[PDB]
From Swiss-Prot:
Protein species of origin: Escherichia coli (strain K12)
Family under the similarity heading: Belongs to the MscS (TC 1.A.23) family.
Periplasmic membrane side: 1-7, 60-75
Entry's localization field: Cell inner membrane
Residue numbers on the Cytoplasmic membrane side: 29-38
UniProt protein name: Low conductance mechanosensitive channel YnaI
Transmembrane segments: 8-28, 39-59, 76-96
Residues of the full protein shown: 3 to 113 of 343
Subunit annotation: Homoheptamer.
Function: Mechanosensitive channel that protects cells against hypoosmotic stress when highly overexpressed.
């Protein structure tokens, strides 16, 4: 009914993504090779993007089929884009801090 049609496929995709995320969380043991700034960061970014896309699709489909007391419902798309941007910025800042720590541990000018 409410979750039928595109909602069913979207829910299945989101459940599969959550299962993959949990599997990756289990896989992630300790840092060293396990923590990949260039690979784990991209994997997490893709996971967040897919999750936000699925949530936005579900919410939009529900609202359009039920109406909304607000103009431009796509504002939630803007919120999802902002969340993705902030997540990517946080990941980039963490990577930069890790690189700075690695350089300092090996010797580099402070300024
Ligand atoms: C665009 C591809 C970037 C690849 C970066 C590899 C980083 C390896 C670091 C190894 C440190 C010992």
């Amino acid at each position: 009914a409410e979750l039928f049609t595109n909602n069913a496929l979207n829910l299945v995709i989101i459940f599969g993504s959550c299962a993959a995320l949990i599997l990756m969380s289990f896989w992630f043991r300790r840092g060293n090779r396990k923590r990949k700034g260039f690979l784990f960061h991209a994997v997490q970014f893709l996971i967040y993007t897919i999750i936000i896309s699925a949530v936005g699709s579900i919410i939009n489909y529900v609202i359009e089929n039920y109406k909304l007391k607000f103009i431009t419902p796509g504002v939630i798309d803007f919120i999802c884009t902002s969340l993705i941007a902030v997540i990517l910025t946080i990941k980039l800042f963490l990577l930069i801090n890790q690189f700075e720590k690695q350089q300092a541990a090996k010797g580099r000018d402070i300024t």
